[PDB]
Amino acid sequence: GSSGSSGMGDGAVKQGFLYLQQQQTFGKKWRRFGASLYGGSDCALARLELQEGPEKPRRCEAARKVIRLSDCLRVAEAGGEASSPRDTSAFFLETKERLYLLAAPAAERGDWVQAICLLAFSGPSSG
């Protein structure tokens, strides 16, 4: 193991760039947002963080977008049929709020869905 000092760094369970379809000026186009998979703890829960590319703090000082995996009511694996570009594999993401259709690379998707489904659907509860 580590005798002297190791140092912090690799924390998130899995890292990868995702694509969330959104609209700003017109039409529905895709937009890359730094995604980070967190979780695997006693108290701390799993959650997906995202980073947008705004211009300036006008309507909101901090423009952050996080989707609590635990919230994911249901998820599926698409074959990249949406507007998304070919040579990829999109996945379904349903949340109490709404349904988000993101796109992922057939390379990562495989693991993504697995991990996500492993965490998001780790320990459900019905209050």
Question: What is the CATH T-level fold of the domain 12-121, as seen in this structure?
Answer: PH-domain like (2.30.29)
For 45, the token pair is: 């829960």
Dihedral of the alpha carbons of 39, 45, 50, 54, in degrees to the nearest 10? -140
CA dist 23 → 20, 26, 27, 64, 93 (Å): 10, 6, 6, 16, 18
Is the distance from CB of 69 to CB of 47 less than 8 angstroms?
yes
Q: How was this structure determined?
A: NMR
Amino acid at 113: V
Return the SS3 of 9. Answer: coil
Q: Rounded to whole angstroms, what are the CA distances from 45 to 64, 100, 126?
A: 18, 21, 17
Instruction: Report long-range pairs for 96-101 (Cβ below 8 Å, ≥24 apart).
Output: 96/71, 97/71, 100/20, 100/67, 101/21
Residue 115: other Cβ atoms inside 10 A: 19
Write the DSSP symbol of residue 88: -
3-state secondary structure of 3: coil
